[PDB]
Every structure is written in C-alpha cells, then in structure tokens.
Design a protein around this motif. Structure first.
Motif, PDB file in Angstrom:
ATOM      1  N   UNK A  16      33.619  46.206 -17.556  1.00  0.00           N
ATOM      2  CA  UNK A  16      32.271  46.001 -17.034  1.00  0.00           C
ATOM      3  C   UNK A  16      32.066  44.527 -16.720  1.00  0.00           C
ATOM      4  N   UNK A  17      31.238  44.237 -15.718  1.00  0.00           N
ATOM      5  CA  UNK A  17      30.900  42.864 -15.339  1.00  0.00           C
ATOM      6  C   UNK A  17      30.550  42.009 -16.548  1.00  0.00           C
ATOM      7  N   UNK A  18      29.683  42.523 -17.424  1.00  0.00           N
ATOM      8  CA  UNK A  18      29.224  41.732 -18.587  1.00  0.00           C
ATOM      9  C   UNK A  18      30.180  41.719 -19.791  1.00  0.00           C
ATOM     10  N   UNK A  19      31.336  42.393 -19.679  1.00  0.00           N
ATOM     11  CA  UNK A  19      32.462  42.110 -20.569  1.00  0.00           C
ATOM     12  C   UNK A  19      33.074  40.725 -20.271  1.00  0.00           C
ATOM     13  N   UNK A  21      33.253  36.754 -19.587  1.00  0.00           N
ATOM     14  CA  UNK A  21      32.609  35.461 -19.814  1.00  0.00           C
ATOM     15  C   UNK A  21      32.750  34.678 -18.534  1.00  0.00           C
ATOM     16  N   UNK A  22      34.008  34.479 -18.124  1.00  0.00           N
ATOM     17  CA  UNK A  22      34.353  33.803 -16.896  1.00  0.00           C
ATOM     18  C   UNK A  22      35.763  34.164 -16.427  1.00  0.00           C
ATOM     19  N   UNK A  23      36.022  33.876 -15.156  1.00  0.00           N
ATOM     20  CA  UNK A  23      37.350  33.993 -14.553  1.00  0.00           C
ATOM     21  C   UNK A  23      37.925  32.584 -14.379  1.00  0.00           C
ATOM     22  N   UNK A  24      39.239  32.442 -14.547  1.00  0.00           N
ATOM     23  CA  UNK A  24      39.910  31.144 -14.473  1.00  0.00           C
ATOM     24  C   UNK A  24      41.178  31.268 -13.642  1.00  0.00           C
ATOM     25  N   UNK A  25      41.401  30.351 -12.703  1.00  0.00           N
ATOM     26  CA  UNK A  25      42.748  30.180 -12.135  1.00  0.00           C
ATOM     27  C   UNK A  25      43.501  29.223 -13.053  1.00  0.00           C
ATOM     28  N   UNK A  26      44.824  29.337 -13.122  1.00  0.00           N
ATOM     29  CA  UNK A  26      45.648  28.450 -13.972  1.00  0.00           C
ATOM     30  C   UNK A  26      46.840  27.871 -13.236  1.00  0.00           C
ATOM     31  N   UNK A  27      47.254  26.657 -13.620  1.00  0.00           N
ATOM     32  CA  UNK A  27      48.543  26.086 -13.185  1.00  0.00           C
ATOM     33  C   UNK A  27      49.722  26.693 -13.944  1.00  0.00           C
ATOM     34  N   UNK A  28      49.447  27.381 -15.055  1.00  0.00           N
ATOM     35  CA  UNK A  28      50.496  27.970 -15.901  1.00  0.00           C
ATOM     36  C   UNK A  28      50.899  29.376 -15.479  1.00  0.00           C
ATOM     37  N   UNK A  29      50.281  29.915 -14.426  1.00  0.00           N
ATOM     38  CA  UNK A  29      50.454  31.315 -14.070  1.00  0.00           C
ATOM     39  C   UNK A  29      50.041  31.539 -12.631  1.00  0.00           C
ATOM     40  N   UNK A  30      50.782  32.390 -11.946  1.00  0.00           N
ATOM     41  CA  UNK A  30      50.377  32.898 -10.631  1.00  0.00           C
ATOM     42  C   UNK A  30      49.124  33.835 -10.618  1.00  0.00           C
ATOM     43  N   UNK A  31      48.692  34.334 -11.781  1.00  0.00           N
ATOM     44  CA  UNK A  31      47.555  35.262 -11.881  1.00  0.00           C
ATOM     45  C   UNK A  31      46.252  34.551 -12.248  1.00  0.00           C
ATOM     46  N   UNK A  34      40.911  36.661 -16.746  1.00  0.00           N
ATOM     47  CA  UNK A  34      39.596  37.144 -17.146  1.00  0.00           C
ATOM     48  C   UNK A  34      39.422  36.836 -18.628  1.00  0.00           C
ATOM     49  N   UNK A  35      38.436  36.008 -18.947  1.00  0.00           N
ATOM     50  CA  UNK A  35      38.062  35.737 -20.324  1.00  0.00           C
ATOM     51  C   UNK A  35      36.995  36.753 -20.765  1.00  0.00           C
ATOM     52  N   UNK A  36      37.445  37.734 -21.548  1.00  0.00           N
ATOM     53  CA  UNK A  36      36.582  38.757 -22.174  1.00  0.00           C
ATOM     54  C   UNK A  36      36.085  38.245 -23.533  1.00  0.00           C
ATOM     55  N   UNK A  37      35.266  39.024 -24.218  1.00  0.00           N
ATOM     56  CA  UNK A  37      34.674  38.583 -25.498  1.00  0.00           C
ATOM     57  C   UNK A  37      35.704  38.181 -26.546  1.00  0.00           C
ATOM     58  N   UNK A  38      36.762  38.979 -26.700  1.00  0.00           N
ATOM     59  CA  UNK A  38      37.745  38.764 -27.761  1.00  0.00           C
ATOM     60  C   UNK A  38      39.173  38.595 -27.301  1.00  0.00           C
ATOM     61  N   UNK A  39      39.407  38.636 -25.993  1.00  0.00           N
ATOM     62  CA  UNK A  39      40.745  38.400 -25.461  1.00  0.00           C
ATOM     63  C   UNK A  39      40.706  37.972 -24.003  1.00  0.00           C
ATOM     64  N   UNK A  40      41.857  37.534 -23.513  1.00  0.00           N
ATOM     65  CA  UNK A  40      42.062  37.221 -22.117  1.00  0.00           C
ATOM     66  C   UNK A  40      42.973  38.257 -21.477  1.00  0.00           C
TER      67      UNK A  40
END
Length: 99
Positions: A16-19, A21-31, A34-40
């Motif tokens: 769900x959208x409200x699961x 927190x934020x989305x992140x691009x990284x230099x450590x990964x091509x993907x 998604x930062x969820x409440x308790x995991x990425x």
C-alpha cells in the motif's frame, strides 16, 4: 486502490502507498529502494514516475521521493526529513520548504 506493484524481475511485491516511508535511488545498486516501516525492498522503477503516482509522493531531492503522509518532522536548517519509523532522508534547498 492505493496498491503499488514493486516490480522485482521474476516476481513483484504489492504494498500500500502508506506502507512506504520513502523511495531512494542508490549508487550501491541498479534498483530503487522502497523504505517500508520495518524493512527495505529493492525494485525496478524511476523516481519521476513514482512522484507522479499521487500528491503525497514528493520529489524533495535527486535521490528521494518521500511519502508526505509518513513524514514525522522536518529540519529545514539541516534539510533532514524524519519519518514515522525513525528513518530519515535529505531534501535539496529548493524543495525542503515545498514538502
């Protein structure tokens, strides 16, 4: 719905959208991340498209699309966005007051 498919190649995870927190691009990964409440969860996407899904999703930095509904507080001087799960990200000078 406010369901988003996080495409992960062979498989997807639907959240769900409200699961989110934020989305992140990284230099450590091509993907993206998604930062969820308790995991990425890493997945395939782009931040521009993600920001266009809904008004709650805001591009505050080259690397971050934040879900406004899950922002706890903002430090405008340091340009740090705090989320309800205690995670943080950063905002550009131009966008920090636009969140």
């Amino acid at each position: 719905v406010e369901t988003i498919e996080l495409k992960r190649g062979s498989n997807s995870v639907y959240v769900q959208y409200d699961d989110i927190m934020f989305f992140e691009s990284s230099t450590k990964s091509h993907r993206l991340i998604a930062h969820l409440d308790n995991r990425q969860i890493e997945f395939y996407g782009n931040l521009k498209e993600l920001s266009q899904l809904d008004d709650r999703f805001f591009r505050c930095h080259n690397s971050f699309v934040v879900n406004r509904h899950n922002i706890e507080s903002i430090d405008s001087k340091e340009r740090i966005v705090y989320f309800k799960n205690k995670e943080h990200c950063y905002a550009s000078v131009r966008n920090v007051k636009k969140i």
